[PDB]
């Protein structure tokens, strides 16, 4: 009945030595993880988490999306702990994670960190995740302006943490964007909305990467654009 058309793109950017973002996109699961750590232990962290989510794409659909998602993330976060325990040569490594799991006309959203999920629906663009950062707290509390908001952040580091989990409606015509801060830091939401207007999902995704890079590509930039269609 309802199906996804998706496009994932990731680029190292114009500055960073390695790409510490990891991404997955398939017919049921979209997922993105921005890793961090000394010596690109951070590609390790982001891969471990994506690797623990992957099975949700091909597993028999669906059932309790949030619970599956919650379990997947906890599993990724235990892998990271195990990694750190086996080499304090990885101490402090971690990753953000934003993922969506689809089933029929519902979806589960799981999030922790400063990667983002957005919905384009009936011509409006909304951010369906909230950055888990000190700056976000400050702006929410009117303590700094949104502009001064242009680190200190929740992350999967192997220490137990519950991410945010939200069940939502998946509607024919929805367009979903997942992105790392390497997109949303250099590129405003008005410009992202423009790119999200491009019909073909691959070309929209390609445009976003191009726009981050035109913006100086200061960080790894990763996107998944996806449509819910009849
Ligand atoms: Mn990173
Ligand atoms: Mn980043």
UniProtKB/Swiss-Prot annotation:
Q: How is it modified after translation?
A: Phosphorylated on several threonine residues by PknA and PknB.
BP terms from Gene Ontology: regulation of DNA-templated transcription; signal transduction
GO CC entries: membrane; peptidoglycan-based cell wall; plasma membrane
Q: Which residues carry this modification: Phosphothreonine?
A: 133, 137, 164
Specify whether Transferase is a keyword of the entry. Answer: no
Specify which residues bind Mn(2+) 1 according to the UniProt entry for this protein: 34-35
Protein transport is among the record's keywords: no
User: What ranges does the Cytoplasmic topological domain annotation cover?
Assistant: 1-230
Changing residue 219 to G: reported impact? 90% loss of phosphatase activity
> What is seen without this gene?
Depletion of PstP compromises mycobacterial growth and causes marginal elongation of cells. Depletion of PstP in M.tuberculosis negatively impacts its survival in mice and decreases the bacillary load even in an established infection.
Q: Which residues bind Mn(2+) 2?
A: 34, 181, 219
Q: Which GO terms describe its molecular function?
A: magnesium ion binding; manganese ion binding; phosphoprotein phosphatase activity; protein serine/threonine phosphatase activity
Q: Reported effect of changing residue 16 to G?
A: 60% loss of phosphatase activity
The residues the record assigns to binding Mn(2+) 3 are: 114, 181
- Which intervals hold domain PPM-type phosphatase? 5-228
**Assembly notes:** 78 interactors between PstP and Mtb proteins were identified using Mtb proteome microarray, including proteins involved in diverse aspects of cellular pathways and biological processes, which contain cellular metabolic process, biosynthetic process, gene expression and transcription regulation processes. Interacts with EthR and may interfere with its DNA binding activity.
Task: Supply any other comment.
Answer: Overexpression leads to elongated cells and partially compromised survival.
Protein name (record): Serine/threonine protein phosphatase PstP
Upper lineage: Bacteria, Bacillati, Actinomycetota, Actinomycetes, Mycobacteriales
Full-sequence portion shown in this chain: 5 to 240 of 514
């Amino acid at each position: 009945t309802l199906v996804l058309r998706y496009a994932a793109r990731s680029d190292r950017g114009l500055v960073r030595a390695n790409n510490e973002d990891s991404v997955y996109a398939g017919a049921r699961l979209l997922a993105l993880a921005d890793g961090m750590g000394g010596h690109a232990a951070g590609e390790v962290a982001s891969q471990l988490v994506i690797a623990a989510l992957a099975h949700l794409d091909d597993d028999e659909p669906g059932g309790d999306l949030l619970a599956k998602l919650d379990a997947a993330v906890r599993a990724g976060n235990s892998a990271i702990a195990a990694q750190v325990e086996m080499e304090p040569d990885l101490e402090g490594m971690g990753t953000t994670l934003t993922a969506i799991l689809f089933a029929g006309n519902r979806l589960g959203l799981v999030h922790i960190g400063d990667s983002r999920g957005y919905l384009l629906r009936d011509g409006e663009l909304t951010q369906i995740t909230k950055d888990d950062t000190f700056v976000q707290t400050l702006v929410d509390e009117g303590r700094i302006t949104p502009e001064e908001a242009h680190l200190i952040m929740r992350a999967l580091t192997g220490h137990e943490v519950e991410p945010t989990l939200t069940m939502r409606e998946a509607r024919a015509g929805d367009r979903y964007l997942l992105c790392s801060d390497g997109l949303s830091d250099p590129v405003s939401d008005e410009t992202i909305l423009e790119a999200l207007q491009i019909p073909e999902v691959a070309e929209s995704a390609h445009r976003l990467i191009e726009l981050a890079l035109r913006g100086g590509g200061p960080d790894n930039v990763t996107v998944v654009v996806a449509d819910v269609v009849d």
